[PDB]
Symmetry: D2
């Protein structure tokens, strides 16, 4: 494993502590053996998410301090509009308070627009993989979300350059089967979050967009981790070997008509989202009308002026290749520490998180007793580190049968915030997990002390078994 | 007119400038004679809104700096939960990104709650007066909004203590006409923003709640300006003459079951909202499931940790009687400057804005040519002050005729941000408006160069007539 | 009296409170009836000084946040060097931690320089008026401080354009008497702080420098309030009616060889000082050598990087004419409030303070019983305002007879920080002092409970007589 | 070599960059081959000093934002007085703008105090080792600075627990030789900066204090790195291995009568200093009278209120053992990386810096050609790292002969700021120096292009010989 040095130094710190073992046991028992219920005060290194937990720069904080809080026509709104033109060549923006807000702005408008043409009678969206909130918004508006990620993504430990790719054969089949009139939009998610932060190649984006344009289908680039995707394109595609990151980004966005973005990810923010539309003014106008009742006025969209200011600066910083090399290299470093110690992971690592296959660590725990959660709980008890389950516990029950949905993989996700933790923190995570290797066989499954009907992973309370 | 000194001093300043007349000419023509389309760089004193434009304290900025950005279990979530229990005696909170986010969280849940017993076949909401966004969500969710404000409010220039009161007779008559089973909720807006930021008396709040509990009707307190309402209760109700402001607030919330709040008003913030529920855990649970797709995870709700931290502090500062006395007294001072010059206003002035009756200023301009907007535009051209229209331009067209819906009053709202402008800024505003008395007769109406089919006040491009 | 509106609005506030009547009485008693011993918690409006209590802009705070803390070669040191070249045309800078630090750097070097070829056996400094620290450093280095302000300054209530001018007659007479080989330097204090912040004319500065240059005398511009002096030159000198403030400043510094500056005044800082030398590289070199042991290394001089950053921005903001017009107008406003009410003041008001002649308010209190302190104490008891004494209590005892040195006048100084207080704060001060007109007769003098042998005004404890 | 993980995470970053090799060559040329003349923009990792370059916490920045800028009686002054009483049990404080400001306040007062006692006719100060500014102030006041560090300090590569100790026999000898009536003060420097940041044992501090008290000699603790010293006492003295760091600190200050402190070191600040006096009120009063003309009024001492606020917080944070173990462990890790690669260092490493013996690295370069500076310059040219010379260049010329003072050791100091650089930055430094092992013999000495008469290391320009 190779450590890559920070292309920055620390300007402000935030104290974190490891509770004593007895405190960690007490806290975890108190949280019903569900770390989502732990107070942050009980957590040392927090790996639940890379969303909104990033460290900003001094320039971002300085931009916040001079932010224009005007209700209409904030100076930072116009800066953000200019930045979107400069990065993406897109002519229209609507800020949002975060990414799911940007989806709530754009997606119902896209459906309405296609319906007003007499189409979208049986409406669907097609994506390489819809993210959780993306699919939920699609389904809230009476549309089917179809996911057609490449079969490369399902071979967890076998390397491939582009595990986030669309399956082009499936794309064409689905267009032919549903009809182009019924495809409200194609959503290109970069990197592909549900494939584990795996990149989509430039040629895949290009071919998807060419097909869509031939059919008149609108394409949305879901852009939370677009810089990480651009880095992978430059690293792995020989055509972009000598291109700058902004050149890669510029080309990527030739292959969408609009973007939705959680700015809480690659733009290095704690809050914020963005809609940008390449040049369809009609859709922009419709989206502005939905922005008003749902988010705010069209020149702040539920964002303080200071956060638009931080976004302008963070959009810039998030494209910096030296930072991206270090950020993605830190994720790869953690994965390599685990992989070299025999811990099975999704490989190669994506831009923002390492996925550990817990089914192989604790074979004795069946899926319906949540083996990845057992590993996560053990990890927390051992170290104060809080990870998140991507397995049976998260997948929930099948609403028709009331029984556990069979999970393809039982993943523990180690989600890495940007510019927050050092490689010594990475070693701490890796060493604590490696150090459980004699304990894995003894670990016990989990049962429900209390279960919600929906979204159970957030608030359910568990109890160990036997 | 009486100037009340600030119970604080200035710690940080933000430069503002008066654009030249020709800059103001070109900007208003560029904005299509709609000041909502003006960039803030074209605006001297901005009176569009008191929402999110407030000046924070050093303690609020300090709280932001130490804010906990944890995705789950943020230290500031628990502080906020503790704060709502202290001020309102409510046991459950859900943060939101702002006020209309709070409404979008709670109101659909209230409809589902009443409906799940066979009720709400013809569902309605009853308020003293729904603000714009509140009534837009009510109607977005298939319900009708009913504004049963006291008719005292419609006698613009005649003093009354409680021009925001419910009309109790209209409340009882609406409950009989529609039936208790169709009334999803009663919404008590404090202060009553649409009535001119006019207070609701404690005895009115009590009688509404008692009437509502007779029929099993849930009561929500729209609480964006609750502190200004508490001040007016202490100022005008003999029972609370010796009460602290917090004691007044505590009593107010005995007469609701939950609250929605834009924290961008009285809690002195630039962003932020809040749902609090007194004790109905079931409605809290349903509300948390809607918060997730629309806003964020339930322990930050579309808000950075730093904004929850600022909200905890701002909630405290917003209750401070010396501050409220000064703030409301500034609004009163501006009103008195105009009223003493023969400029007709809503009297008494409310908590956050002065409302000028422009029907009496430009009689030669009829409603369908937007008299209050002609006055606003003249004020902007004369001085660089940007105000906002509460008249025929806002009201829009009727869904039946496609013609101009008749407006009761043609108001110009001079909305005052908290702790931002001095009484010398007030004098600038008053003197610019007073100096238009020689030019009112010359002004002309406004016609549409561009009119969007909905929300026209935000983006329509008007044009001077003749 | 004319209120002048702020050319800015408030972005951050700082809470200040008026202690109750009983609280102020108890605090003043614990403070031994000396406001210099009051904790700030006991003070509402603080008028002790305009030094280091200014409100900064958002741009200044932003500059602090990105400040470069490098020990050597800070980006902000080069920015400050460039700024000094731009504003003053001076080629060399040495940052200092504040104004008296700048004097400690330069004045001993100037004396050693004058005592390096031949002899300055009776060394003296000559100023229109040495400020307290300036004269203290002069006397600490074995030199006499000679103050030769124009006699117009001593006609307290009669208007004059340039009450800060050098007496040209007394200058030529001092040079003839002491010889140009004993005059270590001439100090041009702009504005003349000890005269009451009164300006020095461009013609006066120029003639002083020409006289100094023909005698080979070095000229230092004491530049704490150099922008306020520039404002007064533009306002009152017809030659500069259409010059910019920066053009006025640029001309001022043609008439000195170096400057010492408290950046805690006109550059709008809370900490900071500066030495700048026009072109004498030898003086620069030796001054750098004293800087190292007394202040710090020469590229930060006892200042954090963020404070050099704030100083670069504040140097710019302090020259802005709209701000200077409001600032000096607010001081003039406080003085016109008192003058129109019969309270005697120095007229016209200087740039930064109002001076009240207290010997006329309490004639029954002789100089040796500190009548101006009795007015200050009464003012504090009535209002919580803290002012400072400039009279017999400050003047101290004559070290020979050990008795009260006769003070020519007894002043109370109402010193006004920059961008901190509103004109309503000014009214509050003025109305409190005016309201004491009926109590001025019954006021008692003060006597010593504890008196230090030196600097007694800072730590002495006083007791009301009778 | 053992990497110790951070007991904090990153909340704000500051971009740094490695200039190209072409840029580093051009910059070093422009700086006359003196890294002290490089702009910070030419520097990647800056190792010039650990003074004032530390990263603060979010709690420290929050304290700055609410800091009280009052001229007299600042809230943060009383907090600072309380904090000194808590940590040191000292009753009196005088804030200073930094450590040499604190020395300028206290040392002249101590001399006058001993002289007024009819003594101090041939005055001296005795220290384990006076720091540069300390010895400068001692000599500026006509006294001799006598350094009597343990001979264990001069066996550079051989471990010893307490290389900062006083030589007790030399202390007793010097007291007799000069006479107690001539010893103005004994200065206990903790850690002993000039011995390399090496600790002084508790028993040494105690014995030195008891000896001083037997002779009536005042003892000052020079306290810039008192927490690092307390850590070493806890780490190495079995008496204290169960004490808290604050218990160790509390015991240390039983063995002094006053302290001077650069708060730019262990209290984790970018600016600030402190005098504290244990109980001698007379010395406190005299030091206050010197504070006023030299630093500022006695309740801010040339510090903004925000910096007294940051100091209160940093004094607490600087005592935290988890932090100290990481900080000192990171310095140790850098030293172990070098030592394990055969690079000769002072061993054990001190609290704040690694010292590399460059005499062993470039034996072909004589001392008066500055071998350590050649290694430093080569390190910069290869890496962008800027280190500082502690050898013949710094040592300067002998006043009596004008020749190069012979240097016992030719050290390169790698000075490590607190909480700024990660262990990956340490690896970068070590790997760059280790990659020079094949270039050391080819390195050539330096000669003067420009040499100032004093303090030449700051400003002299050098040139490679041939
Ligand atoms: C003329 C339109 S400007 C909109 C800002 C604003 N009022 C917002 C209010 C909201 C929504 O809250 P937010 O989403 O945070 O805006 C809820 N309830 C009440 C009583 C309000 O007044 C104003 O200026 O009156
Ligand atoms: C409570 C009264 S004392 C506060 C000092 C302040 N004046 C400071 C000053 C200095 C010292 O500069 P600095 O060391 O930064 O204070 C030098 N030259 C001039 C012309 C000055 O006016 C003032 O009068 O209010
Ligand atoms: C069940 C994981 S919750 C984490 C949600 C976050 N917005 C994300 O992008 O992953
Ligand atoms: C060898 C230069 S010493 C310069 C002194 C400074 N306080 C420091 O810590 O470096
Ligand atoms: Na966040
Ligand atoms: Na805002
Ligand atoms: Na610094
Ligand atoms: Na200050």
């Amino acid at each position: 494993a190779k450590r890559i040095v920070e292309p920055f130094r620390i300007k402000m710190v935030e104290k974190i502590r490891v509770p004593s073992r007895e405190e960690r046991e007490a806290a975890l028992k108190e949280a019903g053996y569900n770390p989502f219920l732990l107070p942050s005060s009980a957590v040392y290194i927090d790996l639940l998410t890379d969303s909104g937990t990033n460290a900003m720069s001094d320039h971002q904080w300085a931009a916040m301090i001079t932010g224009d809080e005007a209700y209409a026509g904030s100076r930072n709104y116009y800066d953000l509009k200019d930045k979107a033109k400069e990065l993406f060549n897109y002519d229209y923006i609507i800020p949002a308070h975060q990414g799911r807000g940007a989806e709530n702005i754009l997606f119902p408008v896209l459906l309405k627009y296609k319906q007003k043409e007499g189409k979208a009678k049986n409406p669907v969206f097609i994506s390489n993989f819809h993210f959780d909130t993306t699919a939920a918004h699609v389904e809230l508006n009476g549309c089917k979300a179809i996911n057609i990620v490449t079969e490369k993504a399902f071979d967890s430990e076998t390397y491939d350059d582009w595990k986030g790719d669309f399956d082009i054969k499936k794309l064409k089949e689905n267009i032919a089967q549903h009809g182009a009139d019924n495809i409200v939009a194609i959503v290109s998610t970069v990197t592909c979050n549900s494939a584990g932060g795996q990149p989509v190649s430039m040629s895949n984006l290009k071919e998807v967009y060419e097909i869509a344009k031939q059919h008149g289908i609108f394409v949305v680039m879901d852009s939370a981790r677009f810089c990480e995707n651009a880095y992978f394109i430059k690293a792995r595609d020989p055509k972009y070997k000598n291109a700058t990151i902004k050149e890669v980004i510029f080309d990527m966005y030739k292959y969408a008509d609009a973007l939705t973005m959680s700015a809480k990810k690659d733009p290095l923010l704690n809050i914020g989202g963005l809609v940008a539309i390449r040049d369809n003014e009609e859709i922009f106008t419709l989206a502005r009308q939905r922005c008003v009742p749902m988010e705010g006025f069209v020149t702040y969209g539920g964002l303080a002026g200071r956060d638009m200011a931080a976004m302008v600066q963070g959009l810039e910083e998030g494209t910096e290749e030296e930072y991206l090399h270090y950020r993605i290299g830190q994720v790869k470093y953690l994965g390599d520490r685990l992989r070299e110690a025999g811990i099975p992971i999704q490989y190669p690592t994506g831009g923002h998180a390492v996925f550990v296959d817990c089914k192989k660590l604790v074979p004795q725990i069946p899926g319906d007793q949540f083996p990845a959660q057992a590993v996560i709980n053990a990890l927390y008890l051992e170290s104060g580190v809080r990870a998140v389950e991507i397995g049976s516990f998260l997948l929930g029950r099948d609403p028709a049968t009331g029984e556990q949905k069979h999970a393809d993989m039982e993943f523990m996700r180690l989600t890495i915030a940007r510019r927050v933790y050092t490689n010594d923190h990475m070693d701490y995570i890796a060493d604590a997990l490696i150090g459980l290797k004699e304990k894995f066989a003894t670990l016990k499954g989990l049962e429900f002390e209390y279960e919600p009907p929906v979204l159970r992973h957030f608030t359910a309370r568990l109890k160990p078994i036997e």
